[PDB]
Amino acid sequence: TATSGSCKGRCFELQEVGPPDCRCDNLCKSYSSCCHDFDELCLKTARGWECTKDRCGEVRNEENACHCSEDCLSRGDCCTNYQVVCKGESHWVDDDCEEIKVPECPAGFVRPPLIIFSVDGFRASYMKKGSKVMPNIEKLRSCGTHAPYMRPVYPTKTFPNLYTLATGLYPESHGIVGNSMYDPVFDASFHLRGREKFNHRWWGGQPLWITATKQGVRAGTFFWSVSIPHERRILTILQWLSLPDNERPSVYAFYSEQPDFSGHKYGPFGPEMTNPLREIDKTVGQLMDGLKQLRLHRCVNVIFVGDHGMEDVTCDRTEFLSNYLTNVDDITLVPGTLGRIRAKSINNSKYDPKTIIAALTCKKPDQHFKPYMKQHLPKRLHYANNRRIEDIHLLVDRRWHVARKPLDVYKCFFQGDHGFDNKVNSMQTVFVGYGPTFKYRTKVPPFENIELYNVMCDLLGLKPAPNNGTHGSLNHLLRTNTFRPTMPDEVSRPNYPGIMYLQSEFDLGCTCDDKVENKLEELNKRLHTKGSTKERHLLYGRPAVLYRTSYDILYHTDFESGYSEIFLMPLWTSYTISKQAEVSSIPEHLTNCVRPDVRVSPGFSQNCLAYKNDKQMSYGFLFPPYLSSSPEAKYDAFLVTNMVPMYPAFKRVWAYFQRVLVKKYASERNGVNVISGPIFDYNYDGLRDTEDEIKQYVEGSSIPVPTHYYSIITSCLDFTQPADKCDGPLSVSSFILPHRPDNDESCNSSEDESKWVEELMKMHTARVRDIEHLTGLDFYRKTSRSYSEILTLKTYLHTYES
Numbered sequence: 001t002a003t004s005g006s007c008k009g010r011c012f013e014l015q016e017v018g019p020p021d022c023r024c025d026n027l028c029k030s031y032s033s034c035c036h037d038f039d040e041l042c043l044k045t046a047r048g049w050e051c052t053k054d055r056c057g058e059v060r061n062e063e064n065a066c067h068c069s070e071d072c073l074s075r076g077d078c079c080t081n082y083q084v085v086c087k088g089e090s091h092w093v094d095d096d097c098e099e100i101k102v103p104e105c106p107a108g109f110v111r112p113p114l115i116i117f118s119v120d121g122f123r124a125s126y127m128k129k130g131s132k133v134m135p136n137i138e139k140l141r142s143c144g145t146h147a148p149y150m151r152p153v154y155p156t157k158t159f160p161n162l163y164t165l166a167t168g169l170y171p172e173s174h175g176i177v178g179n180s181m182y183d184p185v186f187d188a189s190f191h192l193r194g195r196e197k198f199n200h201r202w203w204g205g206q207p208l209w210i211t212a213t214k215q216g217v218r219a220g221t222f223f224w225s226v227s228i229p230h231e232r233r234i235l236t237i238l239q240w241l242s243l244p245d246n247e248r249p250s251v252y253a254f255y256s257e258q259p260d261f262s263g264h265k266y267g268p269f270g271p272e273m274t275n276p277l278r279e280i281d282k283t284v285g286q287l288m289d290g291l292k293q294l295r296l297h298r299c300v301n302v303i304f305v306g307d308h309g310m311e312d313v314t315c316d317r318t319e320f321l322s323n324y325l326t327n328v329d330d331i332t333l334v335p336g337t338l339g340r341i342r343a344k345s346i347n348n349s350k351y352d353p354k355t356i357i358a359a360l361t362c363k364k365p366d367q368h369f370k371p372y373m374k375q376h377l378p379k380r381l382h383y384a385n386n387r388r389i390e391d392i393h394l395l396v397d398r399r400w401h402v403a404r405k406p407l408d409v410y411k412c413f414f415q416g417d418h419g420f421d422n423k424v425n426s427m428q429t430v431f432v433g434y435g436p437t438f439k440y441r442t443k444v445p446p447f448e449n450i451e452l453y454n455v456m457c458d459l460l461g462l463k464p465a466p467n468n469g470t471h472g473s474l475n476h477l478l479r480t481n482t483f484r485p486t487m488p489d490e491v492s493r494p495n496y497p498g499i500m501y502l503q504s505e506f507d508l509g510c511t512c513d514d515k516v517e518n519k520l521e522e523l524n525k526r527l528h529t530k531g532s533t534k535e536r537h538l539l540y541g542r543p544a545v546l547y548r549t550s551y552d553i554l555y556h557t558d559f560e561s562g563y564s565e566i567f568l569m570p571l572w573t574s575y576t577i578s579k580q581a582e583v584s585s586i587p588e589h590l591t592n593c594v595r596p597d598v599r600v601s602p603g604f605s606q607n608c609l610a611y612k613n614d615k616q617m618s619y620g621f622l623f624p625p626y627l628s629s630s631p632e633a634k635y636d637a638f639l640v641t642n643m644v645p646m647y648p649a650f651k652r653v654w655a656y657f658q659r660v661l662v663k664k665y666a667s668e669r670n671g672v673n674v675i676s677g678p679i680f681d682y683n684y685d686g687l688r689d690t691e692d693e694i695k696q697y698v699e700g701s702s703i704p705v706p707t708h709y710y711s712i713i714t715s716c717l718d719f720t721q722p723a724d725k726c727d728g729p730l731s732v733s734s735f736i737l738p739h740r741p742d743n744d745e746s747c748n749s750s751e752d753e754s755k756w757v758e759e760l761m762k763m764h765t766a767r768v769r770d771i772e773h774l775t776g777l778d779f780y781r782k783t784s785r786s787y788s789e790i791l792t793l794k795t796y797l798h799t800y801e802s
């Protein structure tokens, strides 16, 4: 760096100048490449940040940090309280809220600017608990659009979440999978301290600033060096906003290190946390008074958003891997509020992940972490498809840390930390949107931060890069600039087979004790097989298959299915269970009954002999025989086309769900519609596998083994109306259960299923959208609700947090 060039006239330049030209962009400090006069010219502090009565009308002194001279407004460099002190104006916070129906912008503005005001570690409950000391933030919240909280991504660390905000992508896809990382392809490490993190190969997808630039929209900096004070960041944004039309950015970011920085020292609610919340509110006040001076307070859209929350965590709540593993020196641990383990040396072929996992599994009765192979982590975390995520993972209980050995912790510092499971209440953060494009005095339900990129694009008239948001699911936040998506087109149409095969054409090794015999009821069963009860069991239309495949719709009295000729089982099975439905047992005459389905060829059917031969694998049913409507309808549940491969350990889970939980939910929700099916995700990318990706078959057969089983349980949001006769909005909960040959995940699994199955299911709660990705199906195609509302419904996650 030739650092005796000047920053005069160039302070906080938007464009980067290449070596040996010295730099005056912020970031110069982060590279140690600023020109000599950077601090003198760009970080002025003289006289501080506020006008006082004596400064009003002063002669401009270019040394001052900000100005109270007559020419300051035109120049765009007044202290933010100038009109208040010197012209009798009110602070923005003291003005009444008035609806912003249209942007009220200076001539020459082509679109309302967007300012993203991001706050590190701002936990959701600060909005209520700190309300008395945050009056500017409370005005934004109550006058704008707000959610009770926003869900971060896992891990609930800073860079993964800020870069998710910027890209709309899960960490596995954007590549910033932690605050610390090793990439084995690069053979390089990423760390908070130091400068390898500024190398661009870490940062995937397309962040908002690049999306904007590529489409002709200019952007302010998103990264502020820690040594630039907050007052200067605000004044710099306000100066940029005063630029001529051809130079002025349309998108800006502010970032505060608080309240996270203090939260780590004092805990989320330590008495020392009041002051950092006050100071953040003051900074919001400075921005809003500043905008108001420039006549931009009813022109700019402001987003107030956090990256993650903060939980109580101390030194003594640390689990040590040295208390579980004798081999502790042969591993590397990425430690703290999550654990990631790999071999210390890849030339040590002694190292075995399976034995590590087993040494870490259910060893102490209140063990405060749980080991997983990354592919077995709850699918809702989307935390697996990246080479920077180690195969072995530890999910740490809230309030705890994991470390390799005690010397790492003592060689206590801190009372707060974050990083845990993104459904944990303490990790939830905030969202407020204020401006012409957001709604007025509107509360919206909680949503995930992956959704915001799309909205920021909508706010700026940009087409978003491909991302993991569901574009349109946040249309309810917006007064205008909504995105009006169309339902995806069905790719494969189904076959509707009638009766085509005689019983004796099947040689499947299956038996059913079913030989006993009317004319009223003969027409009656024909009609059920033609789909006469289908409006009862298929409430929201049939799911659309969004890929090329061969499948059949099969109708029955109690359930309807889309049966895949390729995978030899249903892609989906749909049924409604009323509040009044009863549970019956599987009779003795049918215990091992499997019956040929005369609508589907032997060639496209499973067979019982494969299951007899496969000593590890059994079978279950997608529509549960326990909930058949009548003894005669129960025969349908034993069709070979309703059978699916299940490990005996998984059958314990599944049978409990089907026999007990479904009926419980129907009683609690006033009927439920259930859609169940298999998922195949052998490469753990979160997306439906093709046939050539399947790694396990039922021994000796072409019957593929699912990695997971899903269910989507829908009812009326107004639970006074039965599921099958609902006029208004829907209510959903779903899960994606791992199809595992043991129950090692559940430490209490030797006990009765009433003590552990439900806890397992809650852990593996899912969005309907997660299931769509995993199956290539599109659900809720035929409702009376608006498509945007259905999109919101498909992104809902039932979290089971109290």
Ligand SMILES: *[C@@H]1O[C@H](CO)[C@@H](O[C@@H]2O[C@H](CO)[C@@H](O[C@@H]3O[C@H](CO[C@H]4O[C@H](CO)[C@@H](O)[C@H](O[C@H]5O[C@H](CO)[C@@H](O)[C@H](O)[C@@H]5O[C@H]5O[C@H](CO)[C@@H](O)[C@H](O)[C@@H]5O)[C@@H]4O)[C@@H](O)[C@H](O[C@H]4O[C@H](CO)[C@@H](O)[C@H](O)[C@@H]4O[C@H]4O[C@H](CO)[C@@H](O)[C@H](O)[C@@H]4O)[C@@H]3O)[C@H](O)[C@H]2NC(C)=O)[C@H](O)[C@H]1NC(C)=O
Residues within 6 Å of the ligand: 169, 170, 172, 173, 174, 175, 201, 202, 203, 204, 205, 382, 385, 386, 387, 466, 467, 468, 685, 686, 687, 773
């Ligand atoms: C969340 O949203 C995102 C974004 O929509 C979804 O991720 C996308 O998934 C797509 C479907 O899998 C995927 O498409 C592939 O792209 C390959 C080209 O990719 C490069 O270019 C794009 C576009 O600019 C870029 O986005 C990519 O960026 C990734 O990689 C860089 C460099 O490593 C990273 O810095 C960055 O973080 C990002 O990493 C992530 O994605 C990759 C996979 O692409 C993962 O491996 C990482 O772990 C991380 O998750 C790239 O720079 C393209 O090569 C693929 O095409 C193959 O497949 C078919 C087969 O028929 C064929 O048409 C092609 O010819 C090709 O096949 C041949 O190559 C095969 C693979 O080597 C080979 O095995 C075969 O034998 C064949 O010869 C494919 O189209 C898209 O790139 C990503 N995008 C991103 C940003 O991740 C994600 O799925 C969503 N999640 C959920 C749950 O919904």
Ligand SMILES: Cc1cc(OCc2ccc[nH]c2=O)c(C(C)(C)C)cc1C#N
Residues within 6 Å of the ligand: 116, 117, 118, 159, 162, 163, 165, 166, 167, 208, 222, 223, 224, 225, 226, 253, 254, 255
């Ligand atoms: C609002 C925002 C801020 C932001 O960084 C703020 C930042 C972090 C650490 C030190 N200093 C800072 O200024 C980023 C990254 C990707 C550049 C980290 C993205 C967004 C978005 N969207």
Ligand SMILES: [Ca+2]
Residues within 6 Å of the ligand: 120, 121, 157, 158, 159, 260, 307, 308
């Ligand atoms: Ca943070």
Ligand SMILES: [Ca+2]
Residues within 6 Å of the ligand: 680, 681, 682, 683, 684, 685, 686, 687, 688, 689
């Ligand atoms: Ca897959």
Ligand SMILES: [Cl-]
Residues within 6 Å of the ligand: 155, 157, 177, 178, 179, 180, 334
């Ligand atoms: Cl990390």
Ligand code: NA
Residues within 6 Å of the ligand: 611, 612, 613, 614, 615, 616, 617, 618
């Ligand atoms: Na078997």
Ligand code: NA
Residues within 6 Å of the ligand: 743, 744, 745, 746, 747, 748, 749, 750
């Ligand atoms: Na167990």
Ligand SMILES: [Zn+2]
Residues within 6 Å of the ligand: 121, 260, 261, 264, 418
């Ligand atoms: Zn932190």
